[PDB]
Amino acid sequence: TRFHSFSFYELKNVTNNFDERPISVGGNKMGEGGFGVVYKGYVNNTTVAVKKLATTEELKQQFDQEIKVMAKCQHENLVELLGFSSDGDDLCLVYVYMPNGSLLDRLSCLDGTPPLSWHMRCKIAQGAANGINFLHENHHIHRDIKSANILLDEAFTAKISDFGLARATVMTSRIVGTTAYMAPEALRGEITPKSDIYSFGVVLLEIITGLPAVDEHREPQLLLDIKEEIEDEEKTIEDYIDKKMNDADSTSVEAMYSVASQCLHEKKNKRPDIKKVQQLLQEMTA
Ligand SMILES: CN(C)[C@H]1CC[C@H](Oc2ncnc3ccc([N+](=O)[O-])cc23)CC1
Q: Which annotated residues bind ATP?
């Protein structure tokens, strides 16, 4: 698949000169979304998201990786790239606008949005698993699966984003990702699709609980420690269910928790593959 080459001056125009002010006050900055700031804009009546990136060469290599992965990978559960603008050091990626922001923002009810229902949460978990399955089937490792990288469209369909660190068991000298979601082997430099499964297991715990992966003012500060508290029978998954829901039944919650627990196996080889995760999430609803 081939993309439209946008002019930098056309992108600067539609985003009102990359205004750093918020949307409510009058600007276009949505906030930031990964080694770059994201801006709302309108191209030919179409609402778009423009990610201005943002060593300079490492950032250009992430820009190229995103475009290469997006050219090869088009799926219902991946964000859609429309085009880009290279033109010097200010690199821009243009996407279809995702009006419901990220799953992290919706789980924390950022800016006063209503809590996501259990029904919406089950659909989002299944959609995100379908997107990771598509990447794995096409021999790609995302390397940064987290709720901030699961975007939500006009119908709350899950859309995986941020493919700058994606790769087609190998080791690396540059350890990348988000600590609170990373598998133990990924924190040691290993590169494998099994690390994406582990990180997805952390996302499933954020969905069940509404709690972020890391909270500096919390005990435990890391969400993955709750798997040990439950396994030692000190507590149960019902004690951690997000209280901002009225439609969560304990049977399907325990079925989603069982998938998350399996994803979070410390031994990479004992985790299920994405196809099994996808099958288990379908059986939960059905
Ligand atoms: C913190 N929070 C307000 C974030 C919510 C999500 C915002 O990002 C985005 N918002 C809307 N559409 C997007 C389309 C593509 C990408 N992308 O990067 O592929 C990011 C997008 C960035 C701010």
A: 30-38, 51, 146-149, 162
Ligand 1 centroid vs 211 CA: distance in angstroms? 20
Decide: 31 in ligand 1 pocket, CB within 6 A.
Answer: yes
Experimental method: X-ray
Please provide the CATH number assigned to the domain covering 98-286. 1.10.510.10
Its CATH architecture, for the domain 1-97, is 2-Layer Sandwich (3.30)
Q: Per-residue DSSP letters for 94-115? A: EEE--TT-BHHHHHTTGGGPPP
Pocket of ligand 1 contains residue 67 by CB under 6 Å: no
R_g (Cα) of the chain, nearest Å: 19
Any binding-site annotation on 147?
Answer: yes
Query: Are the beta carbons of 183 and 199 closer than 8 angstroms?
Result: yes
Q: Is 38 annotated as a binding residue?
A: yes
CA of 38 to the centre of ligand 1 (A): 6
Final resolution, Å: 2.3
Residue 261: which H helix or E strand, with range? Answer: helix 250-263
